[PDB]
């Protein structure tokens, strides 16, 4: 019923037509309701953020100076630093935590990282578009102090007054980082959740963001905490295995398409699946990660994200206690078989 | 093959015949090997105890002064204190921890406790034998300072030099208690395990003791820790539900029949099912519970009882964390479904 989805595409100012159309969105087996698109001055948006519910802010001017960013401009002022760059034979970019790749030997990586100079990525990209290849690239690099003076100028022009104040009103911890993300159309970052508050600032291109609340942990089936893909869903949204993951048939998402100038508040613990529209061109995004507020001095009923916190801790403790993360599953099963199930 | 069981019944001194015969033992679906019966001076027995494996000591003189105990003698020197007495319409005496009876409302007790004077129990017993009723009684009362002078004399005559030294050589903690157990023939105390070291001193009658090592946790299915029957098996040995408890088909026990003068070492965490032989007459036993040695400063591989310790703690912590022990199961299932199973 109320599964509108992203809603009717927005009309770009100056009768320039629809910014995008449904045919650029991929097809999924689950329904979704729309994420509210509001003005930062709108009281509702502040209520949504405080209550940790997603919202799309349209007029923050958060990264106004970056709206002009494009491959050329960047490959001219970003510097000569090294930029992490992932690759993939498919559109899906599953992330792997390398420090955990030891716990699992029978794990075969699908997207390899590769440091390089911006001009190399831009070239490798152009080269990829040359022979009309199928390979896909996704540059994801934290912004360090090694960036050109211009980029630094642009950075200073971000609306710090607005975000810092947001950080203040929510009691959040410190900004841990700003990841710069440049990706090819069709690219997909599979559903996953974070332990930090996220302000996702779109700059170039359009991105479809599908979010699931913490209480859908049961339908999303995250990998084991000690596994490299910790925090990611094991469910393949394109070919879901309902035998292994029955409750994915019950998953209900919240979606929206963000474009140049939109800022999406992705609350801590909320799953998010993000895809760059098909034939939409490269996309550029800069996000802002903040440690969440501290843990209260607790109150029941417990919130969904708190139970997720508990489960993660249990898995961690058992891994240390048993001296081997591989024993976690067999111990958990022994504990519940014929006792709690 | 080597499933001898208790072995051929022992021959009582003075050609008084077999102390008991197989027909007094109940029938079970699992095999068992015999628990070794040795002399306290036998080095092997000391090795078994140190390695925490069960053993039957035949000549400790642990409770020599009590070998003369019988209903009359006791109902003449035990005192006027109160003695806990359980009842049951069946031969099975499942135990219920009352402090936990609040966590589960949908729990209907099967054996009710009832304080009374020794002479009342002896009378109630005689009365029960009068009308040839079916009710069964099992007196289980800790020995306090309110016992007659004679019983106190007898108590002092126990071989403290032997047991105290055992306590010394094993690094055990302190003797927590001595439970006096008087029961009717056919009575059964269902399989369960303890967190303390146990010296089970038989005094009158014969008892069949079936033990299972800690590593059979998977086949015995203990109730949830917060449940009243914590530490007991949910499996009904007389009519085992293989659908709910599949690995009970894999259970392998160690058994033996103890009689007047035998002392059975039931190591901490070892499951024990204890039954008074059918038509064997009332039985009397006094046990000795000691806190185990302290926890080392750990080493892998981990021992079976250590994993049991871990699982109990996990269940306890989650019960507190969630603020309701009833949420433990649903949380554990959410954690493993489609992730660790």
């Amino acid at each position: 019923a109320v599964a509108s989805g992203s809603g009717e595409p927005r009309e770009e100012a100056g009768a320039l037509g629809p910014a995008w159309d449904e045919s650029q969105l991929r097809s999924y087996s689950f329904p979704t309701r729309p994420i509210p698109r509001l003005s930062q001055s709108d009281p509702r948006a502040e209520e949504l953020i405080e209550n940790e519910e997603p919202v799309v802010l349209t007029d923050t001017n958060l990264v106004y100076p970056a709206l002009k960013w494009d491959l050329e401009y960047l490959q001219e002022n970003i510097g000569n630093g090294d930029f992490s760059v992932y690759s993939a034979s498919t559109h899906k970019f599953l992330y792997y935590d390398e420090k955990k790749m030891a716990n699992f030997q029978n794990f075969k990586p699908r997207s390899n990282r590769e440091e390089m100079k911006f001009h190399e990525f831009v070239e490798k990209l152009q080269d990829i578009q040359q022979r009309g290849g199928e390979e896909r690239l996704y540059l994801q690099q934290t912004l360090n102090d090694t960036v050109g003076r211009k980029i630094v100028m642009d950075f200073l022009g971000f609306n710090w007054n607005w975000i810092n104040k947001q950080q203040g009103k929510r009691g959040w911890g410190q900004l841990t980082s700003n990841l710069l993300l440049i990706g090819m159309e069709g690219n997909v970052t599979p559903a996953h959740y974070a332990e930090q508050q996220n302000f996702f600032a779109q700059i170039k291109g359009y991105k479809r963001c599908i979010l699931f609340p913490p209480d859908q942990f049961e339908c999303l089936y995250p990998y084991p905490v000690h596994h490299p893909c910790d925090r990611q869903s094991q469910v393949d949204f394109d070919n879901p295995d309902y035998e292994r993951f029955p409750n994915f048939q019950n998953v209900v998402g919240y979606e929206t398409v963000v474009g140049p100038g939109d800022v999406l508040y992705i609350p801590m613990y909320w799953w998010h699946h993000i895809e760059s529209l098909l034939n939409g061109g490269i996309t550029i995004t800069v996000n802002f990660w903040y440690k969440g507020a501290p843990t209260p001095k607790i109150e029941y009923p417990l919130k969904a994200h708190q139970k997720v916190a508990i489960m993660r801790n249990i898995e961690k403790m058992l891994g240390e206690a048993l001296g081997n993360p591989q024993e976690v599953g067999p111990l958990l099963n022994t504990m519940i078989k014929g006792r709690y199930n | 093959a080597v499933a001898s069981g208790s072995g051929e019944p022992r021959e009582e001194a003075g050609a008084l015949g077999p102390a008991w015969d197989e027909s007094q033992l109940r029938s079970y679906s699992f095999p068992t090997r015999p628990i070794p019966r040795l002399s306290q001076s036998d080095p092997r027995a000391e090795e078994l105890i140190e390695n925490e494996e069960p053993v039957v000591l035949t000549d400790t003189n642990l409770v020599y002064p009590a070998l003369k105990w019988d209903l009359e003698y006791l109902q003449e020197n035990i005192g006027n204190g109160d003695f806990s007495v359980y009842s049951a319409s069946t031969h099975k005496f499942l135990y219920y921890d009352e402090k936990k009876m609040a966590n589960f409302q949908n729990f209907k007790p099967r054996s009710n406790r009832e304080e009374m004077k020794f002479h009342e129990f002896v009378e109630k017993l005689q009365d029960i034998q009068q009308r040839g009723g079916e009710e069964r009684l099992y007196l289980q009362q800790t020995l306090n300072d309110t016992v007659g002078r004679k019983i106190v004399m007898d108590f002092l005559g126990f071989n403290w030099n032997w047991i105290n030294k055992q306590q010394g050589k094993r690094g055990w903690g302190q003797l927590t208690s001595n439970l006096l157990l008087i029961g009717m023939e056919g009575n059964v105390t269902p399989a369960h395990y303890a967190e303390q070291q146990n010296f089970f001193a038989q005094i009158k009658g014969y008892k069949r003791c079936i033990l299972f090592p800690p590593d059979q946790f998977e086949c015995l299915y203990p109730y949830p820790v917060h449940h009243p029957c914590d530490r007991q098996s949910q499996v009904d040995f007389d009519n085992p539900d293989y659908e709910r408890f599949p690995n009970f088909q894999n259970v392998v026990g160690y058994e033996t029949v103890v009689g007047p003068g035998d002392v059975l070492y039931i190591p901490m965490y070892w499951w024990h099912h204890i039954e008074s032989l059918l038509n064997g007459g009332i039985t009397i036993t006094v046990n000795f519970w000691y806190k185990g040695a302290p926890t080392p400063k750990i080493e892998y591989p981990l021992k079976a009882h250590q994993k049991v310790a871990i699982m109990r703690n996990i269940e306890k912590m989650l019960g507190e964390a969630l603020g309701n022990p009833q949420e433990v199961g649903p949380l554990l299932n959410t954690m493993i479904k489609g992730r660790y199973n």
Partner: peptide, 6 residues
């Protein structure tokens, strides 16, 4: 606690 992240 146990209800804490990281």
């Amino acid at each position: 606690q146990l209800t804490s992240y990281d």
